[PDB]
């Protein structure tokens, strides 16, 4: 039964591949440093 063994192995390979795809660590490294560079200042009527 090579066909059934091949299908299980390929289905396993797909299932391992999907598990690897979500295996990660999300990070939030976007602080408010750019907000400190948006100092809106009024033009003075010289």
């Amino acid at each position: 039964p090579w066909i059934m063994v091949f299908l299980v192995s390929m289905a396993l390979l797909w299932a391992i591949m999907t598990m690897v795809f979500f295996l990660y660590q999300p990070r939030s490294v976007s602080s408010a440093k750019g907000f400190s560079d948006r100092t809106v200042y009024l033009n003075w009527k010289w």
Partner: protein, 109 residues
């Protein structure tokens, strides 16, 4: 004749704290530009130099010309000239107030 003698000067300290320094470096030009007109305001105070007319009356043989000069000097007393672009400053003042209100509500948001 009135309004602004050399004693008048606005609070430069609060104004200097308000401006973002080199971002509004024209204020550094504006203060020195206004300071230069203070140098002109340093000279020529309100009253001129007094002149002892009696010394020239006695020294001159005929003091009738000195009396005529003194009478014409007292008659010719010209007052201050007219303000020119005060309305333009007033118009920009109203425009500044609108920009003040617009910037205030946006900053509040």
């Amino acid at each position: 004749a009135s309004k602004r003698i050399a004693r008048s000067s606005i609070d430069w300290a609060k104004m200097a704290e308000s401006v973002p320094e080199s971002q509004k470096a024209m204020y550094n030009q504006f203060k020195a530009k206004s300071d230069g007109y203070i140098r002109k305001a340093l000279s020529y105070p309100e009253q001129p130099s007094p002149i002892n007319w009696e010394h020239y009356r006695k020294s001159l043989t005929n003091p009738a010309m000195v009396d005529a000069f003194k009478k014409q000097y007292e008659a010719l007393k010209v007052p201050y000239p007219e303000d020119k672009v005060s309305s333009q400053i007033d118009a920009q003042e109203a425009e500044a107030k609108k920009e003040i209100t617009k910037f205030i509500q946006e900053s509040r948001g």
